[PDB]
Design an enzyme around this catalytic site. Sequence first.
Site: not given
Ligand SMILES: [Ca+2]
Length: 544
Positions: A253, A257, A456, A499, A520, A522, A524
């Site tokens: 981790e 980053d 992350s 997406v 969906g 726009g 989400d």
């Molecule tokens: Ca979307």
Amino acid sequence: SYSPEPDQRRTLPPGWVSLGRADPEEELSLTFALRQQNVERLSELVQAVSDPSSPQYGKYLTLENVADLVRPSPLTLHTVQKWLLAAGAQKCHSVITQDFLTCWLSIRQAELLLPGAEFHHYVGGPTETHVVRSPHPYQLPQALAPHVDFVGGLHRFPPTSSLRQRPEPQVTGTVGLHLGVTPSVIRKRYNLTSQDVGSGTSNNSQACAQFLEQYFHDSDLAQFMRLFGGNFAHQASVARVVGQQGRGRAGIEASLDVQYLMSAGANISTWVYSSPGRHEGQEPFLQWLMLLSNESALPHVHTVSYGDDEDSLSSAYIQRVNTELMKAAARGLTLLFASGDSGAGCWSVSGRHQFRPTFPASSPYVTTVGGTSFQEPFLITNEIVDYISGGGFSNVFPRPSYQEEAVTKFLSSSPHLPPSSYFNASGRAYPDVAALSDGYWVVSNRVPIPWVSGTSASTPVFGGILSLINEHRILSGRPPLGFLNPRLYQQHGAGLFDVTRGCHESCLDEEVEGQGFCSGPGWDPVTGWGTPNFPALLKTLLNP
Ligand SMILES: [Ca+2]
Ligand SMILES: *[C@@H]1O[C@H](CO)[C@@H](O)[C@H](O)[C@H]1NC(C)=O
Ligand SMILES: *[C@@H]1O[C@H](CO)[C@@H](O)[C@H](O)[C@H]1NC(C)=O
Ligand SMILES: *[C@@H]1O[C@H](CO)[C@@H](O)[C@H](O)[C@H]1NC(C)=O
Ligand SMILES: *[C@@H]1O[C@H](CO)[C@@H](O)[C@H](O)[C@H]1NC(C)=O
């Protein structure tokens, strides 16, 4: 007296063990969150400086300005100081905003100061993180109600790394043309050219923080950059390490980053915040947060991996942390938080299940970053939901005005809405944005490690691209983006790849059958507005 935090969970988290009662003569260091002033006024100033329609846009406060605003009253300062000196506090430090005060006490002194407190030692997790906490609630005098929000170091445990097994080494009959996600893959997909790098000609800078007991290795970054960095100008060292003393073992981790912040925001001065090592009375996140307010010149972009379950936190703590995020927003810092790796989450309450949002991801005052994947393994085409991508609705903070349209549209339009019992439609919804979250390479302890997965990963990628946009802004004489959300939502996610396929996970149960919200058209609450198409996003964030 009264309990400031009756509603802070005190239960021993999985993989922790109680080791013994703390000795009365041990010393520990407790952070006291003092009562701030003018917090409502601060929220107004943030609304103004972050709204691109406001004449005040980009006109951020200095840390000095913020301190002058929010610093506790003389009565508060004097009352708390006298109270602590009396109880035997020593070697105290404050910060420029004067609203945190940390002091060494003995365990004996501390448990007199805070009746009910009973300190034990705990160890947790694969690298044996050590803390000292009370399983019992604590009380303050009534006379401090006006003056103290809470005492850090009492209850909340730091994060420990998952014991989840990544995929094993294996044959296939297609070893791929190319396994997994690398800097080349990120920069190709999100349309950074080789020219898309920092110039070093401004003092633009960026930062990542995470809070697992792991050490940052400059040597791992150097090797990472030799491996993966061949085709874009890069830095092979961090500009500053904050919080790390001594030498210790690297972890996935703490590699992820930095290595990928510095790939997405390439050739930009980078800080690492990384406080392994013994400080048993500190909460790691609170320490980091407090210390933001103790340094006037900070990196413009901070990418942060930290979460609890929102419901686990006290009102006192969550509200105060949200004010600290407001302070950062007033100063024009862009703070990004990973949305989480458990989808909508799963919370068993009152005989039933519901979704389980996380915080600070749920703060109205951060840019929260979810996770996507590719559809086919090898091939860098359209992005879909990564099933782990954290999202959902706060039970604490009401929908901020800047996502009224987006959220209402989703709720009215989504054909796949979960049962209403599972989420709070009234609440701040996340994420705000998204990036790849599946199958990263890192270098840790000089070993390349594939199959690294989680928000992350998405979070420092999205941040780096923002930091490159800031470079453009700063060179052209404009202020940095700072608190981004108002502008992004006002601009309907322009410049981002929307997406629209896939859902993230939730309770594996008879009602929701392992699925939370679905993505969906726009905005989400799985991927937000979506993922960064740099050249397009750059254009939308140039003027103002
Ligand atoms: Ca979307
Ligand atoms: C804040 O900064 C000053 C150094 O300028 C330092 O002396 C002080 O201890 C810092 N505060 C904390 C709580 O670390
Ligand atoms: C990268 O930044 C360095 C300064 O840190 C600067 O000398 C160099 O020109 C930069 N590279 C590019 C390609 O702008
Ligand atoms: C639902 O969200 C609102 C914030 O908008 C909050 O005030 C309320 O307590 C939440 N409901 C529950 C049951 O937590
Ligand atoms: C990168 O640009 C190409 C057009 O060449 C486009 O197909 C792709 O969607 C872009 N990436 C993103 C994340 O929008």
